[PDB]
Amino acid sequence: DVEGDDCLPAYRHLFCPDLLRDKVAFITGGGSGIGFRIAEIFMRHGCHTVIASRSLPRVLTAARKLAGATGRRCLPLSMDVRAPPAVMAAVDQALKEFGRIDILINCAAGNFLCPAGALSFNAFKTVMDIDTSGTFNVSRVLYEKFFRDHGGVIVNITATLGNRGQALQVHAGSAKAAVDAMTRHLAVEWGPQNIRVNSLAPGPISGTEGLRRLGGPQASLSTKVTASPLQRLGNKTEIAHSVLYLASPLASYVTGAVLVADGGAWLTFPNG
Template structure:
């Protein structure tokens, strides 16, 4: 089990104030990591830090926008100065705009790309500098089912997540010589507060996901924790440039098999 021990490690999770980002942060903390949590909203940070504290996890908040390179650079410098190092970076902060491509404003398309693709590049570049110096580091990019599949209404999001998959592979290629592993997690469809309105019985999308997923259900956020711990720990030291899809089997099949 020492392979999965994160005691003494500092983990920076962008957007780790709610949803899947918080689930991953909780998992890393349960394995011993000290948390550094970022967001662009102070209220969300305050609430999240309180929730981590209730569980006995050490978590420090930082307020900045990952797409603002100047602000992000100053924040990373403060984090390294205060915590000594950043061992693990989870690029989780992201947005989605659901709109048909023909109706989408170019400015909105660019905003999604900026947050979901440029943001991870900015943070990886800044954090990797010290990782390269120390010859050690783990970077985890939050990819998506849309890194592989298309769907109505999410052209910008899918473009960004497809790009993030390839950014993951390229950064892994560049930084492997420095003992840095860059991998991704591709979540399937999870039961979060954001998906609650469409997870009611009878909702067409709820029925679609249940029927499309071989396990026949939505994932629970804490089911991402094990994959995150694995990719952040010594257990994955020779795993690089990969995206691990935690999707209940969606990508393995053209559809959920008919009844027993």
């Protein structure tokens, strides 16, 4: 893996390189962090991407690196997942450029550490809007604009925070638990349109804004990482492999599932 939002210098295939040949994946948050590596790894298996987030310069920069490293197409778009007309405009544009969308990865999210007693009403609601309503919004627009009529696959990038009520995280754990339930609800309603919907819940991942923001001090982090079952942080590529699995015809019979890829961290990490 690479720490920054840059592409791998080399890659060995474990899935066939034509696994998503000529498919198109729409990736919210695909300009940094996990969403960046997911876009890269999809493109190394023949997939074209659309990457969409608020920051136009961020997606433009990412798109040039992704296309450069892989030779597939990456369409960068500016859109806030909370603004349905912008989501609609983005999906219209993707359809016009590529003609099809096969996979939606809902990776956009926001998080920060804060005691629940100190978190403002707006702060709590901002996270629910971005993670939960934003995931609903983008799924809801895809369904309507393409997936209802053509089938499709969704992966929701979630978390394990809500499992044990991770301190300082009431906002993110609540929103992410909402998205996991949302995964089952959509899996039930939309499966008969040939749409699969699963969640993938990463553990602590090196080279991501999430870890830089939420990981805490270095010394306290190593101790919890060393006491976790695989004894290390996960990396962006490993997460992208799991997401790629779930988005691919190799998960043809998998829907309504939450796959945890955390190295067993949620089983042992401290809380309180």
